[PDB]
Design a protein around this motif. Sequence first.
Motif, short mmCIF file in Angstrom:
data_model
loop_
_atom_site.label_atom_id
_atom_site.label_comp_id
_atom_site.label_asym_id
_atom_site.label_seq_id
_atom_site.Cartn_x
_atom_site.Cartn_y
_atom_site.Cartn_z
N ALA A 105 16.68 17.18 49.94
CA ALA A 105 16.44 18.56 49.51
C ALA A 105 17.75 19.34 49.38
O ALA A 105 17.94 20.02 48.39
CB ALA A 105 15.50 19.27 50.49
N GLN A 106 18.63 19.22 50.37
CA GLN A 106 19.94 19.91 50.35
C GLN A 106 20.83 19.47 49.18
O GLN A 106 21.51 20.31 48.58
CB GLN A 106 20.71 19.74 51.66
CG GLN A 106 21.98 20.63 51.73
CD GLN A 106 22.80 20.44 53.00
OE1 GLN A 106 22.85 19.35 53.57
NE2 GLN A 106 23.47 21.52 53.44
N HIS A 108 19.66 18.22 46.34
CA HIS A 108 19.03 18.82 45.18
C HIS A 108 19.46 20.28 45.00
O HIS A 108 19.85 20.66 43.92
CB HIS A 108 17.50 18.75 45.27
CG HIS A 108 16.83 19.22 44.02
ND1 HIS A 108 16.34 20.50 43.87
CD2 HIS A 108 16.64 18.61 42.83
CE1 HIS A 108 15.84 20.64 42.66
NE2 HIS A 108 16.01 19.51 42.01
N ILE A 109 19.41 21.07 46.07
CA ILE A 109 19.74 22.52 46.00
C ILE A 109 21.25 22.77 45.73
O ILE A 109 21.63 23.68 44.98
CB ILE A 109 19.28 23.23 47.29
CG1 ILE A 109 17.74 23.27 47.37
CG2 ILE A 109 19.90 24.62 47.42
CD1 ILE A 109 17.04 24.08 46.26
N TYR A 110 22.11 21.94 46.30
CA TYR A 110 23.53 22.00 46.03
C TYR A 110 23.81 21.79 44.53
O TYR A 110 24.59 22.53 43.93
CB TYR A 110 24.25 20.95 46.86
CG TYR A 110 25.72 20.84 46.63
CD1 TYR A 110 26.62 21.67 47.31
CD2 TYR A 110 26.23 19.88 45.77
CE1 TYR A 110 27.99 21.54 47.11
CE2 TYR A 110 27.58 19.75 45.57
CZ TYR A 110 28.47 20.58 46.23
OH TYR A 110 29.82 20.40 45.99
N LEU A 112 21.69 22.28 41.99
CA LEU A 112 21.19 23.43 41.25
C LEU A 112 22.16 24.61 41.31
O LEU A 112 22.49 25.19 40.28
CB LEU A 112 19.82 23.87 41.77
CG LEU A 112 18.62 23.02 41.36
CD1 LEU A 112 17.36 23.67 41.93
CD2 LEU A 112 18.51 22.85 39.83
N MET A 113 22.62 24.96 42.50
CA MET A 113 23.56 26.07 42.66
C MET A 113 24.83 25.92 41.81
O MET A 113 25.34 26.89 41.29
CB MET A 113 23.92 26.24 44.13
CG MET A 113 22.85 26.90 44.94
SD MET A 113 23.36 27.31 46.60
CE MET A 113 23.94 25.76 47.28
N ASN B 42 18.09 29.82 47.68
CA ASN B 42 18.71 28.51 47.54
C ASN B 42 19.98 28.36 48.41
O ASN B 42 20.11 27.36 49.14
CB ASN B 42 19.00 28.20 46.06
CG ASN B 42 17.77 27.62 45.31
OD1 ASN B 42 16.65 27.53 45.87
ND2 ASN B 42 17.99 27.21 44.05
N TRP B 46 20.53 26.25 51.94
CA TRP B 46 21.71 25.39 52.04
C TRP B 46 22.52 25.69 53.31
O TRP B 46 22.94 24.76 54.04
CB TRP B 46 22.59 25.50 50.79
CG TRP B 46 23.70 24.46 50.78
CD1 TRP B 46 23.62 23.19 50.27
CD2 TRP B 46 25.02 24.61 51.30
NE1 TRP B 46 24.82 22.53 50.46
CE2 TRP B 46 25.70 23.38 51.08
CE3 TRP B 46 25.70 25.66 51.92
CZ2 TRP B 46 27.03 23.19 51.47
CZ3 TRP B 46 27.02 25.47 52.30
CH2 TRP B 46 27.67 24.23 52.09
N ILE B 80 11.64 28.26 48.63
CA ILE B 80 12.48 27.61 47.61
C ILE B 80 11.65 26.61 46.80
O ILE B 80 10.56 26.22 47.21
CB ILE B 80 13.69 26.88 48.24
CG1 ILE B 80 13.25 25.65 49.06
CG2 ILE B 80 14.50 27.83 49.12
CD1 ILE B 80 14.42 24.82 49.58
N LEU B 82 11.60 22.80 45.21
CA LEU B 82 12.19 21.46 45.19
C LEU B 82 11.48 20.60 44.14
O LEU B 82 10.32 20.85 43.82
CB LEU B 82 12.06 20.78 46.55
CG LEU B 82 12.81 21.32 47.77
CD1 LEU B 82 12.38 20.50 49.00
CD2 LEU B 82 14.31 21.26 47.56
#
Lengths: 133, 133
Positions: A105-106, A108-110, A112-113, B42, B46, B80, B82
């Motif tokens: 998940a982290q 994935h979010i990294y 996206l950001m 997001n 993180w 969030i 995912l």
Amino acid sequence: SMKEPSQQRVKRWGFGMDEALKDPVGREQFLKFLESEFSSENLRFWLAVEDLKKRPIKEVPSRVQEIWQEFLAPGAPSAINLDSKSYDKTTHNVKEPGRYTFEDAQEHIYKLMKSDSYPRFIRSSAYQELLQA
Amino acid sequence: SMKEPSQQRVKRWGFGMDEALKDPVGREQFLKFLESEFSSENLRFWLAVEDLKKRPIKEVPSRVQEIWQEFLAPGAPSAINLDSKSYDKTTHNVKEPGRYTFEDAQEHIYKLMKSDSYPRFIRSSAYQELLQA
Ligand SMILES: [Cl-]
């Protein structure tokens, strides 16, 4: 007593690995063969993880450590080979239980950001005003 | 008291998100910006996971649950988004701590047996003898 497996049942074990594994006699024969040639560590590890999924949750921490000791730890009597990526994840999970719960998940979010939140920040009036000053 | 960030420092945050994040004033500004546009969940997620990786291990189960509650549980205040794959893995880790410790290794080994152990079994005298007789 059990009846002799039919010809078709035995033939069906050759239709794919899932077929052989879902038949209890097929699974027994597959394992017996691998043991006879000292090559059963991979199937035995796969079977040990399958068993892990059915265990009561309070048993999980000790059973996780047993599987690691048997198949993956230094000097493990049934040592298996993994790719580095999957070895790394596994060791972190065993040694730091729960700590890497949000790892995929982290990541994935990294990602996206980097494509949305951050580029907007660099374009923002707030950032331009800090540049000036 | 802190001095104003130099122009050189502010510029540096533009050489990559990692640069902005490792500067605690850059991190602050990035977060402030995202909050002004209601899009900070997001980065907040993180940062919460980064914090988790620093916590004492006995605190990890409760902290894992606190992160799940804030970003991911039903009705989470800082919900969030995912991708399915990430969300599935995360839920399993949260609801069944430890149980999927070997997930990626087991997948590696499953695919390896399809190319190695399984074909070796089917071409063996053990299997071929069954078929014949
Ligand atoms: Cl051979």
